[PDB]
A paper describes a structure:
Trace amine-associated receptor 1 (TAAR1), a member of the trace amine receptor family, recognizes various trace amines in the brain, including endogenous β-phenylethylamine (PEA) and methamphetamine (METH). TAAR1 plays a key role in regulating addiction responses induced by these drugs. As a G protein-coupled receptor (GPCR), TAAR1 is distributed both on the cell membrane and intracellularly, with a predominant intracellular localization. TAAR1 mainly couples to heterotrimeric G protein, Gs, to stimulate cyclic adenosine monophosphate (cAMP) production. TAAR1 is a novel target for several neurological disorders, including schizophrenia, depression, and substance abuse.
To obtain the agonist-bound TAAR1-Gs complex, an engineered TAAR1 construct was designed by truncating eight amino acids at the C-terminus, fusing the apocytochrome b562 fusion protein BRIL, and introducing two mutations: F1123.41W and H632.44V (superscripts indicate nomenclature according to the Ballesteros–Weinstein numbering system). The engineered TAAR1 was coexpressed in insect cells with human Gαs, Gβ1, and Gγ2 as well as Gs protein-stabilizing nanobody NB35. The structures of the METH-bound TAAR1-Gs complexes were determined using global resolutions of 2.66 Å. The relatively high-resolution density maps of the complexes allowed us to model most portions of TAAR1 from residues K15 to I323, the entire METH molecule, the Gs heterotrimer, and Nb35. The cryo-EM map showed the density of METH in the orthosteric binding pocket. The binding pocket of METH comprised 14 residues of TM3, TM5, TM6, and TM7 and extracellular loop 2 (ECL2). We found that D1033.32, Y2947.43, and the biogenic amine group formed a hydrogen network that was highly conserved in the aminergic receptors,52−55 indicating its important role in amine-induced aminergic receptor activation. METH interacted with the surrounding residues via extensive aromatic (F186ECL2, W2646.48, F2676.51, and F2686.52) and hydrophobic (I1043.33, V184ECL2, I2907.39, and G2937.42) interactions. The F186ECL2A mutation eliminated TAAR1 activation by METH or PEA, and the V184ECL2A mutation reduced the METH-induced TAAR1 activation by half but did not affect PEA. In the predicted apo state, F1955.43 pointed toward the center of the helical bundle and the orthosteric binding pocket (hereafter referred to as F1955.43-in), while in the active state, the agonist binding pushes F1955.43 out to face the lipid (F1955.43-out).
Author numbering:
A (entry chain A): 9 to 60, 205 to 254, 262 to 394
B (entry chain B): 13 to 351
C (entry chain C): 8 to 64
D (entry chain N): 1 to 128
E (entry chain R): 15 to 232, 246 to 323
């Protein structure tokens, strides 16, 4: 029984040495926020990574808070199995090229993908940060007679810019109307089934550099604040 | 030209196969077992609770000694436990935290893991000097790793989310053979007791029987309506079971080439994540999305017990080679040993 | 394409010509195997706690 | 095995009408969402319409709303598409797709290049 | 001995014993329910159970003797025990109030610094706060009573007042009363109020933003919770302290019966604390119900 006691003591010593390192790593794990970056091939998903093989990973920190963003690459277009791995991320960054309003119907495909993500049973607590790229390209397309929005959306004709909207100076009413029409398109999916457990944060990104990280930071802060308020019976 | 004629030929071939299987369907498994006395009520309790994982647990694998076991978690650790006294023998930090599967070598000298990195990693547990290190990385898949099982210390079979299964030689890190024929993503694997064949289920509601040497598909089994999530051989190697998202478990026979029995209930509408057999093959155990695990009578299709102790989705399941314990992982980061 | 259709037809033809042993024989075999190894299953029959390695803490 | 076989279609003058049909077997029809997908020549797969498990919820793309109509008959396991008015840019192959899983509000991969629960398709063309 | 009837004193006995039973049982249930489930071992639940322990000690050690004294006006207990009882009561009451203040600070860090909350509020700081709450009031009370610092400077009034009431009478001078008011009541309550006002403002702003965002295209909760939390504390503690801070400045013109009412109003806070901080939140109710069903 002497050898048994010796081996049991060695086992316990190894166990406590492992538990010490586990305790050390728990602090690092609980002080980090994980993001999922999602999009299409040409919709963007590149300059956002520029701002800073089966999966990519980017590390950035603002105000001494650490963020880990996970870019999915070399995966098939069938997403319904590996999307379940991201149920506990702080937010999902959905990247959309809003200029492609003329398969070639990219906006409707993005809308269907957004609806599937929003209504998935394992992503019912995950917030989405919505980015709409190529507003300059959208404005150039709208100004010219290259194409139209009414062909794919026979409701933009009966749509007018809301009063509370804040167009940037020197912007035509038509392009602003199109931008807010697309934003409200996404918002009508988002507001139908939220129930307060997750929200959507749409933004208009054109060429901004390093402002996008600040927007993500503020949106994550708001997301966690709302979770804390809701868990304290204050919201 | 030749198009729209090969489709017709496939149609006649499928009709012929269905007619042959219908002709060979003499009776049902229920009728012969209808005189068997019911098993009764299987009451099982938790004996151990293994704690120390941060994120959710996707996979676990028992050891051949029925005492050690390995588990994987999304926090980026591979922990080796002692099921007796709940001691942690090892804890391997992974280069990629999106792991989805793990395997324990039958010899006991290696473990494997993989996931969304499209890489299978092999870890040496018996290094002469230092600690546990990674020995070999198997590259060549174009989708995520779903499962992996050792054949010996130098051969491992993997399935991937690129619709293919592969066999590798660990010494050189090259694919001996590549198994193709699935149209959806392959989700689960199971090796036969003879280590000569293996079955797989994919995201096309079909299961296939493979030959490791010839590298060919021998039989294809259908009957499920949605994606197949788990697969496991019967102890004698003549049958297997599957669990899919249509809230159903089915038992298929290799020799009869058709389904034998269906394990389902009206109240159950969630998918099935894991499935395993008992040592004698009399009890079938399945893990569901409703946070519970059901104990089925494999010969009479009626539920016999429930293992309800988890607060989140049950992701993995396992029975010892000895057969005296069941381990269950979950999305709540807890491993429970039931007896 | 033509090649994939040819491969599918060849695989279907290869699966067409095999042997089968009828369902009743298979059911009898599974019944017999379950009956033979009844005493070796500790989950089906609760083993006495004296030799249970997980009973003691 | 799950089978989706499309019928109907053919050549029709502009401004004409058609009624596509899709017979389903191998699964419980009522528990699944259904869709209509099409592929124009030189283009990828695009979603056209969908209908819920009972038929209460219906959606269309902007190019076909007001003209096309989708209906389902759970008793006979058939999916319909009444194509009231046609335009020269409606020439494509039409597939009936199925939701991956039952009792779900989301449809993920029904429009991907390969997808196990789609049909063979019927060519529909309008020229003159 | 007091000019009281038998039926009224029996009913009053029943009232106090019911209060004691409720105070004991609520905190006992809170402690057992929180400690049983290893899932509910967050650092805030440790503050909650420490507060429940303080309230349990109030229920057991101090309250029955206060019942006897306030019923009979005589205190057939002795002289040194009417030096330990007074110190223990002040100890435990101050500890409970400090625990309330620390819970408020925890809520403030959870709400106003949500991205660094888990790193900032861990087991170490919670343990430090629990140690402070249990230690500082002990030293203060036992070194202020047994050193006879409260009545120092005015002895004849102290003696005539402890002769008017039978054995025990919590007595303070002007400076002693002011210092006790500042240490045990004013500062923690001010902290809780200044935290909860800002929390209310933030919650109302977020609710307004969410409602407008939802209703642009197409039931307040902070008010009820914060009102309950602050109002129970105020209506259970403000009378006693506000009367005691001014009693030395009015030549001790308070009737003994008013003192009894103030004391038992102060005691009722320990009865009401577990309901406010444990039973209010649904997760505790679910855990308690599951535990109860597990034993049946
Ligand atoms: C109701 N508690 C009083 C009898 C004693 C006291 C006085 C000041 C501060 C705390 C406690």
């Amino acid at each position: 029984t002497e050898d048994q006691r010796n081996e049991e003591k060695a086992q316990r010593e190894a166990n406590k040495k492992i538990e010490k390192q586990l305790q050390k790593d728990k602090q690092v794990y609980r002080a980090t926020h994980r993001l999922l970056l999602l999009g299409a091939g040409e919709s963007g998903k590149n300059t956002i990574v520029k701002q800073m093989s089966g999966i990519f990973e980017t590390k950035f920190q603002v105000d001494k808070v650490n963020f880990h963003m996970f870019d999915v690459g070399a995966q098939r277009d069938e997403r319904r199995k590996w999307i379940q791995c991201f149920n506990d991320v702080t937010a999902i960054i959905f990247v959309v090229a809003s200029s492609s309003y003329n398969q070639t119907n990219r906006l409707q495909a993005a809308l269907k993908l957004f609806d599937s993500i929003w209504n998935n049973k394992w992503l019912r607590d995950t917030s989405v940060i919505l980015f709409l790229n190529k507003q300059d390209l959208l404005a150039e397309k709208v100004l010219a007679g290259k194409s139209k929005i009414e062909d794919y959306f026979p409701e933009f004709a009966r749509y007018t810019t809301p009063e509370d909207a804040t167009p940037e100076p020197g912007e035509d009413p038509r392009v602003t109307r199109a931008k807010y029409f697309i934003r409200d398109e996404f918002l009508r999916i988002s507001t139908a089934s939220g129930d307060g457990r997750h929200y959507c944060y749409p933004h208009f990104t054109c060429a901004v550099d390093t402002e996008n990280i600040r927007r993500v930071f503020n949106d994550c802060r708001d997301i966690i604040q709302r979770m804390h308020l809701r868990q304290y019976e204050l919201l | 030209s030749e198009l729209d004629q090969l489709r017709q030929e496939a149609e006649q071939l499928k009709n012929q196969i269905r007619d042959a299987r219908k002709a060979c369907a003499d009776a049902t498994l229920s009728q012969i077992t209808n005189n068997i006395d019911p098993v009764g009520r299987i009451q099982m309790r938790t004996r151990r609770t293994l704690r120390g994982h941060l994120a959710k647990i996707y996979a676990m694998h028992w050891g051949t000694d029925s005492r050690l076991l390995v588990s994987a978690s999304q926090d980026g650790k591979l922990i080796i436990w002692d099921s007796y006294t709940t001691n942690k023998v090892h804890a391997i930090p992974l280069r990629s935290s999106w792991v989805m599967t793990c395997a324990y070598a039958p010899s006991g000298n290696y473990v494997a893991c993989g996931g969304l990195d499209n890489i299978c990693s092999i870890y040496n547990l018996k290094t002469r000097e230092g600690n546990v290190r990674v020995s070999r990385e198997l590259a060549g898949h174009t989708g995520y790793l779903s499962c992996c099982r050792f054949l010996d210390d130098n051969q491992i079979v993997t399935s991937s989310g690129d619709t293919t299964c592969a066999l590798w030689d660990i010494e050189t890190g090259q694919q001996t053979t590549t198994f193709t024929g699935h149209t959806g993503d392959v989700m689960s694997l199971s090796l036969a007791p003879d280590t000569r064949l293996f079955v797989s289920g994919a995201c096309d509601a079909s299961a296939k029987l493979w030959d490791v040497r010839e590298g060919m598909c021998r039989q294809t089994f259908t009957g499920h309506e949605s994606d197949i999530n788990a697969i496991c051989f019967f102890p004698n190697g003549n049958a297997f079971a599957t669990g899919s998202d249509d809230a159903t478990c089915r038992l298929f026979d290799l020799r009869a080439d058709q389904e034998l029995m269906t394990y389902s209930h009206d109240n159950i509408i969630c998918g099935i994540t894991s499935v395993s057999f008992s040592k004698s093959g009399r009890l079938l155990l399945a893990g569901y999305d409703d946070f519970n695990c059901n104990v089925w009578d494999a010969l009479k299709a009626d539920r016999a017990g429930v293992l309800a102790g988890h607060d989140n989705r049950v992701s993995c399941l396992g029975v010892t080679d000895d057969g005296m314990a069941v381990a269950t992982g979950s999305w709540d980061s807890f491993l429970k040993i039931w007896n | 394409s033509i090649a994939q259709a040819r491969k599918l037809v060849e695989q279907l033809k290869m699966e067409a010509n095999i042997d089968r042993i009828k369902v009743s024989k298979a059911a009898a075999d599974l019944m017999a195997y379950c009956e033979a190894h009844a005493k070796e299953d500790p989950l089906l029959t609760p083993v006495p706690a004296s030799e249970n390695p997980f009973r003691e803490k | 095995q799950v089978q989706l076989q499309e019928s109907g279609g053919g050549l029709v003058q502009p401004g004409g009408s058609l009624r596509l049909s899709c017979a389903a077997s191998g699964f419980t029809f009522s528990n699944y969402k259904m869709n209509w997908v099409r592929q124009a020549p030189g283009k990828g797969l695009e979603w056209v319409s969908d209908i819920s498990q009972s038929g209460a919820s219906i959606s269309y793309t902007g190019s076909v709303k007001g003209r096309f109509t989708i209906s389902r008959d759970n008793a006979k396991n058939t999916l319909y598409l009444q194509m009231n008015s046609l335009k020269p840019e409606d020439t494509a192959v039409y597939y009936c797709a199925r939701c991956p899983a039952p009792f779900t509000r989301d449809c993920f991969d029904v429009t991907s290049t390969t997808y196990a629960y789609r049909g063979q398709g019927t060519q529909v063309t309008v020229s003159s | 001995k007091n000019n009281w009837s038998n039926d009224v004193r029996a009913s009053l006995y029943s009232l106090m014993v019911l209060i004691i039973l409720t105070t004991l049982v609520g905190n006992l249930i809170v402690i057992v329910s929180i400690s049983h489930f290893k899932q509910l071992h967050t650092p805030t639940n440790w503050l909650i159970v420490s507060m429940a322990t303080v309230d349990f000690l109030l229920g057991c050690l101090v309250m029955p003797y206060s019942m006897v004294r306030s019923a009979e006006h005589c205190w057939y207990f002795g002289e040194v025990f009417c030096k330990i009882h007074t110190s223990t009561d002040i100890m435990l009451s101050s500890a409970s109030i400090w625990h309330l203040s620390f819970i408020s600070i925890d809520r403030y860090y959870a709400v106003c610094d949500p991205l660094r909350y888990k790193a900032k509020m861990n087991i170490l700081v919670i343990c430090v706060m629990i140690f402070i709450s249990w230690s500082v009031p002990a030293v203060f009370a036992f070194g202020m009573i047994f050193l006879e610092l409260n009545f120092k400077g005015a002895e004849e009034i102290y003696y005539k007042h402890v002769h008017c009431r039978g054995g025990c009478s919590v007595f303070f001078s002007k400076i002693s009363g002011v210092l006790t008011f500042m240490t045990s009541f004013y500062i923690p309550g001010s902290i809780m109020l200044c935290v909860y006002y800002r929390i209310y403002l933030i919650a109302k702003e977020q609710a307004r933003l969410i409602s407008d965002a939802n209703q642009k295209l197409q039931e307040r909760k902070a008010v009820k919770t914060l009102g309950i939390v602050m109002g129970v504390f105020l209506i259970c503690w403000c009378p006693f302290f506000i009367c005691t801070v001014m009693d030395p400045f009015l030549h001790y013109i308070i009737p003994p019966t008013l003192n009894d009412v103030l004391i038992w109003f102060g005691y009722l806070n320990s009865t009401f604390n577990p309901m406010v901080y444990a039973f209010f939140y649904p997760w505790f109710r679910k855990a308690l119900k599951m535990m109860l069903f597990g034993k049946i």
